[PDB]
Every structure is written in structure tokens, then in C-alpha cells.
Amino acid sequence: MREVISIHVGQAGIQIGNACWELFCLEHGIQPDGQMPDAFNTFFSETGAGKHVPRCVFLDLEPTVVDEVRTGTYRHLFHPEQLISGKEDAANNFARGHYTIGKEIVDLSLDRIRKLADNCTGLQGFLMFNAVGGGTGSGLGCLLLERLSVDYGKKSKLNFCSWPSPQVSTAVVEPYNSVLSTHSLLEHTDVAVMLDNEAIYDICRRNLDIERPTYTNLNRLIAQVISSLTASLRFDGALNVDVTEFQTNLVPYPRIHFMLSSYAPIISAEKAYHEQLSVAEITNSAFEPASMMAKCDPRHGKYMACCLMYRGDVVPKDVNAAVATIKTKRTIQFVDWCPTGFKCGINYQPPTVVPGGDLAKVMRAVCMISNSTAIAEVFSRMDHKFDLMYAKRAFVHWYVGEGMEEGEFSEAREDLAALEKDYEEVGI
Amino acid sequence: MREIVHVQGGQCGNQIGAKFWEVISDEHGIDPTGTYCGDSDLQLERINVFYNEATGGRFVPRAILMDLEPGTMDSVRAGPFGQLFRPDNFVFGQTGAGNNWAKGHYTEGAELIDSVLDVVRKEAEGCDCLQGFQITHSLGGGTGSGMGTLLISKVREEYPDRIMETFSVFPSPKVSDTVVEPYNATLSVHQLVENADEVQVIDNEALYDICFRTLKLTTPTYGDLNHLVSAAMSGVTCCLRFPGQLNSDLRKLAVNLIPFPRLHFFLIGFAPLTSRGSQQYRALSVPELTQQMFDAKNMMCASDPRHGRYLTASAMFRGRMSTKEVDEQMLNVQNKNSSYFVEWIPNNMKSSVCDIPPKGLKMSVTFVGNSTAIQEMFKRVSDQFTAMFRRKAFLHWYTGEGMDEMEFTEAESNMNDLVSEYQQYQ
Amino acid sequence: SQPVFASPLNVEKRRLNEERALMQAQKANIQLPPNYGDMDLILFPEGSLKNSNNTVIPQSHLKGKSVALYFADGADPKCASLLPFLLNYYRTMNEGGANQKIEIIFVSLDRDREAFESHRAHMPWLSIDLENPLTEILKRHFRVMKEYEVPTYGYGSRTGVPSVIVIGSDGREAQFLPICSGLEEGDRALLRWDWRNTKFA
Amino acid sequence: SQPVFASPLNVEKRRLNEERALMQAQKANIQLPPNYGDMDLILFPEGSLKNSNNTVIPQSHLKGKSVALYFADGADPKCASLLPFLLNYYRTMNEGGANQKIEIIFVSLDRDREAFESHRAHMPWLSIDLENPLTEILKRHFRVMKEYEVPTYGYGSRTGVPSVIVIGSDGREAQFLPICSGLEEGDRALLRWDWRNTKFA
């Protein structure tokens, strides 16, 4: 029936996917075994007596992060060969992950993809989780998308890339990995969402009041966003929008598919007692510049387009009262050619809290994902970093030794320059 | 999955390596007799990186012992945890290169390298794919420097793609061990610079300074000094053996610390380091790890980093620890000490989390920093090397052992050029 | 089978219930061994609990409560630091109400009876004496240990002393309060204690 | 007469069953001697099994479980290797469920009482006391031996210590877990356990 295939590539992909899949299990009431005590068909298959298995693949050339999945609590949940492991690390090298080591793992991945795709028709599309900062997240993440786009042409391909933080990076060669990724995910991805690490750090700081957060704390919040985004497919709602209708309303031009993310409310057991969680108040916090999840202050651009997802006891007339207030407010500016730029989505089902986590149980939630022109800033700052380090051939010899030709850096740079100009000319 | 092949060469390499396997056995809960104790899964899911099953239940180390004289072999074998090693993994000499680089690299090490290259190939080809090699030796000696660097040239040619990690010790500024130190250091460097993928520098002056001011130990022997060196050896490779929130291995370090291929020399630091008395006074928190980490007192290279600028730096955090204060503090240190960091690279610092703490502690960090302040050690060797070569002292053994004179001029020219290229980025 | 399997509480519970199931099967498509849902135990014996003024309180009067076991030691500086804040929290919770809501049963890690009485003389909430094996069996069941002294069966030590664990009707941990835990959010994790959800059914 | 004819359990069962057969035959074409299908025994007497709290439980407590005998030696390095995985498997696949699936009965091959109780303290499932004849009789029944000390009757040893064997109601070998056998699936053969079809009924 109506199914969506999830792909997790690299460290960032796998760890996020671990958080994504545990939420879906608790959501639909399936167990670590995979058998429940027909909403779940979008994520889980039907196998044997009563068991459901995920429609996912795990890819990494590093064994130690995907083997640990096979070791952990959820052994029996995942398919034995839906977690593909390499033998040797990508080591932050786009060339290594795209040319040298990743070639023998692509065809092993495509075997699992097509066999999982061909069980039924009406496949909505694909969810992609990767880190553009990383080696296999960027290199092997790319290589999969050339092989996917040529055969499975038609279908939607959403990407949830963890863009590098402006101040913090997980790596020092990551400007090189960034420029090469952003070249090759332009024409292979239909919708790209920017996730940022320090953006979710300071959300965890001022909202949940967690002075000591970690990657597990971050990935809970990210898994809530993915669940809120696809809640329309799984559960019936008053006014639903699916995966396919995102790119209709968010992507006005072929080159322009980079967009923000924000989730509200993010309230612990501390604060949850002491406000209305009113529809007006949660949509006010959603548009707040401090609640962005990409670390770019969105006031220095124009909101090109916007989508709002709603969960729980949300009535349609409260949405319209909410969105009228936002239009009235002149802190948030709009582009001239898009006079109406809001697409609402309402689902009846409230979010389900994982026990002993950090979010509180709440009646309703908003997941606002929006295309803006302020993305031209984060592309420009990353560009400035790449130009200084490249100009005298730093770290080049790693890349050019591994197969790629000196001239893919120049071609990727000029292509990013076209992306600079394209965002500039639109936003005037 | 992955395996690290260990090579220990010379007197200083073997004593360091003997202590190294003692803490790895302790971390993985291996009884000295060979068996397994401790009864936990986390100790053992990645054991193939350093050990091998022996169908008797015992784990043999993945190590090669290398010397040109059997004196120091006896010390390692007769020590505790000495029956761990396979007896055939040892290789012997009989002559012993009298701390002569030429005699270890051309005459006495040449006829031995046939035999031990077999033992490497025996262990290298043995597995699925190997992750890389790790070599501990001394650059001041004969059988460690001269014959050790010969193997590095040999095994690089046969396994080009695999990584090349060397834990080397250097001549000290103050004390004189092995009076022909600059001759051995200079001749080792201009070969190790193109054949080793990452090099990490230890100096005995730095170690005694740590025993002065931090540990407050009054009589440290080579037993104590090698413990601290061995602690960073396990700390740099922790994430290969244990899971973690963010993964790293040796190639993560290589791609994130090497701007140009010629410059691959590091400064190693370990934190925390406090005396027995001050153990229960100190709040082990991520703020106080990073302030001790960025201290000249903590580096194991005796070159003050505050003179130079950190070109790039890496920190492998270990333990149950929150990653915001991991992430923010690396950024936060770059903001105030903006004068200590190079400008034309944003975010010089790389961080990783390794969620299994070392034995007896709760959190720890190992610092691997590519600093241009390592120039101060290289200048001192070149200054000393030019002092003797100009009057051609101690040359007749080096030139009487089938080695040309013009090798020396190439040695000083290359290493002076290494000094010159640090200068422009400072 | 919650929160643990290899505990003396769960072993005694499995014994009794499967005994009872076999007798019901003897008297009468019955499922052996009985489900964890159909399993039942009585947790605090009638002569287990006693109040401040040293009078017996039965288990049956723990109905409609948010009840928590306080594993504590007399000599521990962390315990001595935690104690005044928990005292203030208990007072301000139980005073702003006609009837009382939260309740703390004290489990001791003290060295002897004299230390037990000396520490217990401060506390106004309920306590279990040291000699009762209830303390030891609850301690193994909820995985509290000061140090690894007793064989635990492949468990990891869930807590260090002190720790407050909110319990349910069947010995299931209702919620974990992270004083010295995965969050390390000491001395003010007592705020996280919710009382809608944690009811002694 | 399963798995071996020459075993103490089988001869004891033979004696009892045809004792009753002759008695009722004299009391009355009743088939003599009775079929092995007609044969039924009590495998564990009243005082055999003791759990983690040293409380005796009858055989009747094991209905609808998947029971496995674990022949173990305290000093054997292969047993030292096998033990943590066995603990973890028991732990998780029994805990994470709405049924109590499996149960393990420990049979010792240690030197003496001190070693036996020391190894049994590290263990949450059931055990048989070393003094009790049943351990030796089970060893002969299932043909496990560390070395050829006790004379098997001109046949092979089924396995060596350590061994996990799924058993039935009548001493029938339900399935053999290939720890150290023909398959040689060390520490991963646990996953071959099918707890559906092997019920102690």
C-alpha cells in the first residue's frame, strides 16, 4: 500500500535512525520482537505470524556503529541483512566514499532497496538521513542518489541532512566535504532540510533546561520532527498533507529546495504545568528566531514558503486565527511574488512521549518547516571558509590521491556560486 | 572487522610496548595467564583489534617484538604479563647496533629484516582486512631508529593504502643520552617524514616535568613514565575498541590534522592528571578537562605551544559525558585564545566521544595537536647537527658502513626545509 | 518480570503465582506458566511498615499515593546533602492539600541498628527496619548497591546511594528520579516527580 | 528408552511403570511390558530444584516453559566464555515479553561443595544440589562428561562441558544447542533456541 522507504547512511544517519525507529515502535505499540498485541503499514511490513519488520536500510563502511545496533535491545526488530556493514572507514574523505571504497557497497545496498520496494505499488518516496560533514554520509550518501535517481525516477526523495555548525564542525576538512555534497545533492534531492547541531544544543539549553545534553537528547527531538512530519500518512486528520504535497508548496524553483525546520512546543515537566499550550502560543514560539533548528537568524531574509504541521486537539479555526496573527506581525517578512504562502496540516493524534526522556506529555504540537532566503547566508559563510583553505591546496592531496581529479573542486565551487546568485536574484 | 598490527623496535620501543599491553589487557580484563575474567560483554565485542583466539581459550597479542640484541627480550618475557606473547613473535639479533643509524639500517638490520618481514606478513595477511600499523620506537638509538625506520620504509611499500601511526621519542634538550643523538635524529627524520602517516612526539624532559608538578611522584622510574605514555596510546585508539556517541579512528585523525603531507607531527597530552593527595579534591567536569588540556605543563613534547600557533588540534574525549560542553568548549577556547589559533582555517578543533571510561576513572581526554611550536625542537636538532657536521665529527663509522657522505647533506637539507615550511604559516 | 527478572522478589512471585495457577488448573485452554499480567504478589507484609511514632501501618493504606522508596545511607555526604531538600519538598507537597499525596518509605544502607535509629529519628516519613530481609530483597530488585559486594546476575548497578525510585503496585518502577544517574541532575531532580501518573493502584 | 536405553532415569522409569503395570494386571489383553508411549515419570522429586532464594520448588512449577539444562563447570575457560552470553540471552528474551518463556536448570561438574555454591551464587536460574544423586544420573542420562571417567557403555559422548540442552517432559532431548559440537556456533547458537515447540508439558 502507501509506503515510504527510510535510508540511513553514516554515523549521523544511523544514530538518528535509531531514535526514529524506537519512536515508531512505541507509537504503533509494536514490541522489540516486532509483533503487536492498519496505521503502521507506512513503516512496517507484514511477515510470518504477527511480526512486522521495518522498511529501512542501514549503511555504513564503519562496522562499529551498525554492529552495535545488532548487539543492542532491538535485535529481532530489524532484518538481518537490512543493516549493511563495510570493513574500512571512509575517514572524512568524499573521494574515498564516492570512488574508492564505496563502490562495492552500493550494489549491496541497491539489492536490498529494490527487493523492499517491489513488495507493493503506491510507494510514496524515500527519506534520506546523512551528515554532509562526514565521509560516508557525504560520499556514499551521494553515490546512492545517482543510482536511485536513474531507476526510481518518479518518486519523491526527501533529504534530512545534518549541515555543519558555523562554530563547531566534528571535523576540520568538512568545508571540502560540504562543497562537494552541496554540488551533487542539488539535482538528486527533491526537498532538503537543514539540521544543525548547535541549533539543537541551545534549544535543549533554554527550553528543556538541560545543562548536560548529549547526542541521545538531540536525536529524540529530531525523531519527534520526523514523526510529526509523517503523522499525516499514518493517522487520519481533519486536513492532511502527505510527503508528495510538500514539494508542491515549498519548492517554487528547481534549484531552490533548501528549507528551515522548527518544532514547538519543546517543554519539559518543569514548564508544562503553567501555560496554556494554546494554538496561538505554540505557533508564536514556532516562528520565534530563537527556535530555529538550523542556526541562521531568519530575519535577514524573506520567507519564500511555509508549511505547518499540527498534532493533537487542534481545531481548524484556531489555525486560521493563528496564521492571521503571523501575517499581521511584521517581524516576519514575506516575498512579494508569494502573497499566500501557508499550507496547513492537522492530525488528531497527539505525540507519544518516550518514558524517562526529556519532553513532557503535551496535548498538541506544531512542526513548522519553511523555505526562506536567509539560507543564502549559511551557504555564503561556508563558501568563504572553502575559498581560504583551497587557495593554497590544503588537504587536497588526500582527495586527489583517492581518485578524484583536481577540477572537481573548481567545478563544485562555481556551481555553489550559481546557488549564491540564484538565492540572491529571487529574494529582491 | 578491523585489526591493528603492533610493531615494537629497540630497547625503548620494547619497554614502552610491554607496558602498553599491560593496560590493554587490564582494560579488556585479560588475566596474565591468557584467559578471560570480568564477565561483561563490552570488554570483548572488539577484541580482534589487538588479540587473537588460540583454541585453548587464551588471547595472544597482535604484536611483533624486534631488537638487535636479546637482552631486553628477556626483560619483557620474564616480567608479569610476559607469557601473553607468542614466543615466535620475538625476533633476535646477536651483534646489536651500537646506537649507530648506519649499522642498523645498512649492515646489521639488513640481514635481519628478511626474517621479521615474514612475521609481519604472517600476521598482516592473516585477517579479512587490517586497519593499519602502530609502531613504537626510539629516534635516539640504533636498533630502534635505524632498523625501525627501515621496516617503516619496507612495510609502507608493501601496504601503501593502510595507515602508519608511530609513537616516537626524541632527543631531549637538557640531558644527554647517546651522544650521537642529532646524527641519529636527523637521519631518522628525513626518511620518517615521507614514510609515516602520523607521528606523535614524546620527550623525556616533558615526562619528568609531569612527574614534578602534576603527579607529585618523588621517585618515578621508566616504569612510571611509560605508564603515562601507554595511557595516551590506549586513549587515541579507544573508539576502535569501544562504542561511543561520535566515532573516531586513526584516519579520522589523519584527515583532520594534516593540511600538507610534509607536516604530520603532533603534541600529545593526557588529562586529568592529579596526585594521590589531590584525587578527591577535584571536580571531574568537562570545563576542568579542557583548561588542563590547553596547558603547556600537560604536553608530552617539551616545546612550549604558546610561542607557536595550533595549526589544527584534536581531542578524543572519553567517558559518560555531555556533548554540549564537549562541543561548546572547543568553540569557546577558540574565541578567547584567537591569537593562539591560525586564521585561514575555521574551527581548527576536532572532538570525539568514547563512552567507555578508562579503568579507575570516570572521564578522560587525549590531545593530539598539530602545532607549529614543534619547530622549536627541530631548530635545536638542526643547530646541533650543523655544529658537528661542519667539522665532520663522528663520521667515519657512518661513512665506513656502506653509506655515502651526501646522505648527510640531504638529511639536513630536507629537515631544514621542514623547519622553513612551519615558518610561513606562523 | 519488571523492572528486572533475576530478583528475589520476582523469584518468590513466580513461585507463588505458578503454584496458584497449577491449583486453579487442578480444580478446573489454560496457559502455563502464567502471564506477567496475571502474576500477583503482596509486597510489604502486614508487619513490614511502621510510621514516625513507631506504630504499625499496613500496606493497604498506601492506596491513592505517589509512593517512592528512598535508598539512603547515614554516613554518605551526598545523602546528607540531599536530605534537607527532600525534607522541604515533602513538607511543601503534603501541606498544600487537605489529604496527602506523596509518600516515602525509607530503605537503609546503615552499618548497624544504632546508626539506623539515629538517622531515622530525623525523618517524618515511613521506614523499614534494618533486620527485615525486605530491605535486602527490595535492594536487589531495584538494583541499588553502594559497592559491588553481592553477586548480581549480569545486572549493571542502576543506582548509587542515595536514590529515590517511584514504585508501582506490582514492583514496576513508575519513574526514575535522576539524582546520581544518567542525567546527574542532582538535588533538584525531585522537581521532576509527577503525581498524576504514579499512583499506587 | 530415549535418548539412550542405558540410563539411570530410563531404568528407574521402567521399574516404576511396569511395577504399576504388573500390579494392575494382577488386579484385573493389557499389553506387557508397557509401551514407552504409555510410560510416564516424575523427573524431579519434591526436593530437587531450588531457585535464587534457596526456596524449593516442585516439578509442577515448570509447566508451559521452555526448559534447558545447563551442564557447567566453574573452572572451565569455555564455560567462562559462554556464561555472560547465556545470562544476557535469558535476561532480554525473557524480560521483553508478555510471557515467561524459558527457564534454566543448572547441573554442576565442579570439584566440591565450596566451588559449587561459589559458582551458583553468580546465577539467577534454578539449580540442582551437587550432593543430590540427580546430577550424576542426569549426566549419565544425557551423556555429558568433561573426560572419560564414568564408563559410558561403548558409545560416544554427546558433548562436553559447557552444554545447553532443551529437555522435554520425559527426559526427551528436545533439541541440542550447538555450543561446542558439530556446528561449533560458539555463543551464537543460543539464537537457534525455539521456545514455541519445546514446552515442558
Binding site: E68, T73 | - | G156 | -
Partner: peptide
Amino acid sequence: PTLPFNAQSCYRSEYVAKPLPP
């Protein structure tokens, strides 16, 4: 003097078989 090993991962501490909502 020895001490037992009492550490488990972030995964084991945070990811268990959670009870389902009623």
C-alpha cells in the same frame, strides 16, 4: 585490590523495552 566492571553504554541505559501507553 580489584574492582568489578560496572559500566554500560548510552544505548543500554536509554533504550529499553518501554511499556506501551494504555
